[PDB]
Amino acid sequence: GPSSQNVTEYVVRVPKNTTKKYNIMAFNAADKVNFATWNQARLERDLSNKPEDQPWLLRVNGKSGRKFKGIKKGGVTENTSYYIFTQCPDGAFEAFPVHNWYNFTPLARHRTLTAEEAEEEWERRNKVLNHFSIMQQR
Amino acid sequence: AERGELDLTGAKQNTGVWLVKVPKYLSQQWAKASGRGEVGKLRIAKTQGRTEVSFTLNEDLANEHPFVLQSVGGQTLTVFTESSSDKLSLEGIVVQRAECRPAASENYMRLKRLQIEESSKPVRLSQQLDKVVT
Amino acid sequence: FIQMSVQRIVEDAPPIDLQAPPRYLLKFEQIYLSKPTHWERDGAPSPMMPNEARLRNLTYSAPLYVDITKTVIKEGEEQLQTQHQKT
Amino acid sequence: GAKKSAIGQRIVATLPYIKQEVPIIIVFRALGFVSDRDILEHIIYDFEDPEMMEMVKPSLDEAFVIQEQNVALNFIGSRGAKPGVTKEKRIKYAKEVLQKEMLPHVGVSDFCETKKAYFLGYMVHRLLLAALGRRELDDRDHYGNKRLDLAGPLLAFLFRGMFKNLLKEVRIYAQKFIDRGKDFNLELAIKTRIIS
Amino acid sequence: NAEKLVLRIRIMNSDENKMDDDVFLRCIESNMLTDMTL
Amino acid sequence: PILEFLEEWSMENLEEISPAAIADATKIFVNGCWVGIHKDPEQLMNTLRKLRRQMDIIVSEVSMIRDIREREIRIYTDAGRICRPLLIVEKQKLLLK
Amino acid sequence: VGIRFCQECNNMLYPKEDKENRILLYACRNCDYQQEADNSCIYVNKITHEVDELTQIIADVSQDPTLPRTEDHPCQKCGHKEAVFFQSHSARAEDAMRLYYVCTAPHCGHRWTE
Ligand SMILES: [Zn+2]
Ligand SMILES: [Zn+2]
Numbered sequence A: 001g002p003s004s005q006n007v008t009e010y011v012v013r014v015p016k017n018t019t020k021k022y023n024i025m026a027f028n029a030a031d032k033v034n035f036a037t038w039n040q041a042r043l044e045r046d047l048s049n050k051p052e053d054q055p056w057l058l059r060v061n062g063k064s065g066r067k068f069k070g071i072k073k074g075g076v077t078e079n080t081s082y083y084i085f086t087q088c089p090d091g092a093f094e095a096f097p098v099h100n101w102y103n104f105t106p107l108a109r110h111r112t113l114t115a116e117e118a119e120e121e122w123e124r125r126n127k128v129l130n131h132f133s134i135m136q137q138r
Numbered sequence B: 001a002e003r004g005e006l007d008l009t010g011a012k013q014n015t016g017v018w019l020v021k022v023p024k025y026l027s028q029q030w031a032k033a034s035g036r037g038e039v040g041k042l043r044i045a046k047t048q049g050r051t052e053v054s055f056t057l058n059e060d061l062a063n064e065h066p067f068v069l070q071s072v073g074g075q076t077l078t079v080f081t082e083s084s085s086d087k088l089s090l091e092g093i094v095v096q097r098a099e100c101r102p103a104a105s106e107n108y109m110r111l112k113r114l115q116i117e118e119s120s121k122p123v124r125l126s127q128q129l130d131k132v133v134t
Numbered sequence C: 001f002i003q004m005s006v007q008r009i010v011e012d013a014p015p016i017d018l019q020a021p022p023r024y025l026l027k028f029e030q031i032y033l034s035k036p037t038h039w040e041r042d043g044a045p046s047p048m049m050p051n052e053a054r055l056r057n058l059t060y061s062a063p064l065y066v067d068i069t070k071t072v073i074k075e076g077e078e079q080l081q082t083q084h085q086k087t
Numbered sequence D: 001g002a003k004k005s006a007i008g009q010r011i012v013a014t015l016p017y018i019k020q021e022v023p024i025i026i027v028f029r030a031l032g033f034v035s036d037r038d039i040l041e042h043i044i045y046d047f048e049d050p051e052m053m054e055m056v057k058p059s060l061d062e063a064f065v066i067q068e069q070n071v072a073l074n075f076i077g078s079r080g081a082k083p084g085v086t087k088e089k090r091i092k093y094a095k096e097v098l099q100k101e102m103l104p105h106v107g108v109s110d111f112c113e114t115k116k117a118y119f120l121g122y123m124v125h126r127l128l129l130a131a132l133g134r135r136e137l138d139d140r141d142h143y144g145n146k147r148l149d150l151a152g153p154l155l156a157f158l159f160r161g162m163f164k165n166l167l168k169e170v171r172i173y174a175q176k177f178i179d180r181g182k183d184f185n186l187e188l189a190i191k192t193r194i195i196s
Numbered sequence E: 001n002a003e004k005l006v007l008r009i010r011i012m013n014s015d016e017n018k019m020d021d022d023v024f025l026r027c028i029e030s031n032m033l034t035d036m037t038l
Numbered sequence F: 001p002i003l004e005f006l007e008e009w010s011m012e013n014l015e016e017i018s019p020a021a022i023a024d025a026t027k028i029f030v031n032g033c034w035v036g037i038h039k040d041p042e043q044l045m046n047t048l049r050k051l052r053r054q055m056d057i058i059v060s061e062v063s064m065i066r067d068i069r070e071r072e073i074r075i076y077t078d079a080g081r082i083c084r085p086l087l088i089v090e091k092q093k094l095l096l097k
Numbered sequence G: 001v002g003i004r005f006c007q008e009c010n011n012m013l014y015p016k017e018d019k020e021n022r023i024l025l026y027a028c029r030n031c032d033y034q035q036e037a038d039n040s041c042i043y044v045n046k047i048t049h050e051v052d053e054l055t056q057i058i059a060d061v062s063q064d065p066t067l068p069r070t071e072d073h074p075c076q077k078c079g080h081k082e083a084v085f086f087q088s089h090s091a092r093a094e095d096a097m098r099l100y101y102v103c104t105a106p107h108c109g110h111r112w113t114e
Helices: A115-123 A131-137 B009-013 B024-033 B106-119 C007-010 C050-056 D024-031 D036-043 D051-060 D071-080 D087-101 D113-132 D149-181 E022-036 F003-007 F041-054 G059-063
Strands: A009-013 A020-028 A041-045 A056-060 A065-072 A081-086 A093-097 A100-107 B018-023 B040-046 B051-055 B063-068 B075-083 B088-100 B127-129 C016-019 C025-036 C037-039 C045-047 C064-073 C079-084 F011-013 F026-029 F033-038 F064-067 F071-074 G015-017 G023-028 G031-038 G082-089 G099-103 G112-113
Touching: A020 A081, A081 B024, A081 B088, A115 D071, B009 B088, B024 B106, B106 F003, C007 C025, C007 D149, C016 D149, C025 D087, C025 D149, C025 F071, C064 D036, D024 D051, D024 D071, D024 D087, D024 D113, D036 D051, D036 D113, D051 D113, D071 D087, D113 F033, D113 G112, F003 F011, F003 F026, F003 F033, F041 F064, F041 F071, F041 G059, G059 G099
Parallel strands: A009 A093, A020 A100, B018 B088, B127 C025, F026 F071
Antiparallel strands: A009 B040, A020 B075, A041 A056, A056 A065, A065 A100, A081 A093, A081 B018, B040 B051, B051 B063, B063 B088, B075 B088, C016 C025, C025 C064, C037 C045, C064 C079, F011 F033, F026 F033, F064 F071, G015 G023, G023 G031, G082 G099, G099 G112
16 A cells, blocks of 8 residues: 555754753653653752752652652763654644753652661661561651 | 643643754754754655655755664653743653764765864963063 | 873863952963073073083973963952963 | 671672762662662663672662662761761762762763763672672783873873962962952962972 | 482471561571581 | 764763663773763774774774673773784785785 | 562562461562562572573674684584684683584574583
8 A cells, every 4th residue: 555655755944943942851661651640740940959950850640649850961962962853734844952851760759768767777787677677667 | 720730731642753863063054044944854765664764955055864763662752841931841752763874984074073173172282482481 | 291281280270269349260271381491690591401401400391381361350340351471 | 697698798889088888779879769670770781680680689678778869868978078067968968979079080060970870880780790700800910901101191190289289379379468458469479389 | 319309498387386487598598508517 | 082973873872771772782981981882883893993094083092992792892092001003904914015 | 580679669579478368479668569479489599500601692702803713513593604612711610611602694693502
């Protein structure tokens, strides 16, 4: 059929400026990220340092859902550029430079041992019993 | 609905986009005018059991760019944008990755050498001074 | 070392920031070297030949100069930038 | 020991400007990799190798208590040569130590933690191969592991120490005059005998 | 007679009837490998 | 110049890769810094060797080492490396004529 | 031997026993998560460790010009006469003199030992 030999060619457009900047969001394969349950999400700068030069914090479904932290790619693309092609009704490809690259990883939520609590366990770090029980006591 | 809410509509539509790695000279030429609305045409040719992607530089822009696809199963990529009006949205999900390579091999290095020399202009070196400073 | 390392060392040095409140900055940019010179008792410079250094027990050394740019801010919406060439 | 020989052999790291070494996994926690899979992905590149996975088990147990990046940073800061007065300052000190002092050749930028984790994992990966006998130990006598400091690099070593003194000296000279209220003469601030 | 020589070991019944039922075997296994003398 | 050329060729940066890809690929080291990974080490070494011999981007004193068993390519550009000139042999023949 | 990671926080799963059912369970720490173990072996170490070197051998070594090449041991997979032979030369063996052969034909990384 036509698909066996289909040839497609589209025009490429590079607008001088866009109101919204384009950046890449990367998720590790092992994360098994699924957007079906992403009913609501929140993306904002971190408050630990306390703006444009700080990491990005991503929250999904409020506190109940998973939380991800994005970090700007340290390696700069001085000799490289990245472009994204998006389908449009006019049928011409549009390329937007990647303003930033962000790597997001899930953050586990639970009663993580505090800094003060970790001090007590440091005494038994060399010799500890029933690693499971340590969390139960906490 | 709030300022920090993310418009995840693009994810719902499962829109697919392509991530392309291109050299600076190709983008530099685009950055030269960057306002004519046209820089070239992307041609994709498919056969019975093989697909090839190539890009052609505009004749006016100049005054062949074969494309190689890459597997995207090892990492999941998504594209999002931040609006100047504080309205973040997700453009779509990356479905394929491609890279651009130079058709020429010998004379292409000549252009790279000029860039390396050009980037060497800020590299300041000590200067011999004929007469002692008085 | 002379052509690259010395210049890189001077360039890589952080600018000197001083606060009084007037603020002072010193930035070193360009490094110059003159030919090995010897200064007589009267203070007249002259090129130093290696044999003369050997005979007169001198050190075969070349003067080193650096271009220093000084910028001063006195919280009066005025900035004065004075450069001392070949310091 | 009863439990000493059960976990096995654990890996520690001796980072600069820290009096005592720290568990290896803690350094990964400080760099921003919390989950075990994320840390092990930087150390073991082939999960199908059971031999490599066992070698890191004792290291994971040692740093089991520390489960957050901030907790790990505080642990690193607590052992710093200059312990912080408060917990917040300890984290800042630990961040600075890893940012610049740890594997500086990998990077010093604020966003180089990922690159430093890969190389640090490579250092661990190289250690495991030596422990597993898969790779031969490096030879100190092998002359491709050596470098020769010629006149240039030797002189460049002196110049930075002597140039730092020059810049320190002008700072001290200028500070006296600035505090006095009078501007300072740049020519007089420079002590030429320092380099000569 | 079997080509493979085997020796199955289990903890006493009285204790079964405090440290850990699983880790203790590793401590025994490591202890018996080196400390024990045949 | 080495890093710029490597990025141009089919070398993936460490940041932009998943760890699952590092198993098959060969690590690329430049002055001891793990720059990235490459899927065709043999072709890269041929290209790297060609550039050095033509003195295009790679200077003569740059040493490229491929550890085939360890799946690592080490490129060294720093000072202090002791080297000697050796005649290149191709197909059991001297390129010197 | 199999190493399992938690599906919630991607942390290590350690063996655990449920007295209610008396079945091995891999329970995540600090995650109140449990999984049904199937291997039934939680720990195994081989002191002799007769691990095959062919698995460790990498087919790319056939491109090494410093390795000797023999035409007297043709590849079984493809019949290529040329082969590159070497010794493991890896610690923990205590006797490393046998030769492992790797086919030199491109795309055929067949490895064998005589
Ligand atoms: Zn878990
Ligand atoms: Zn074969």
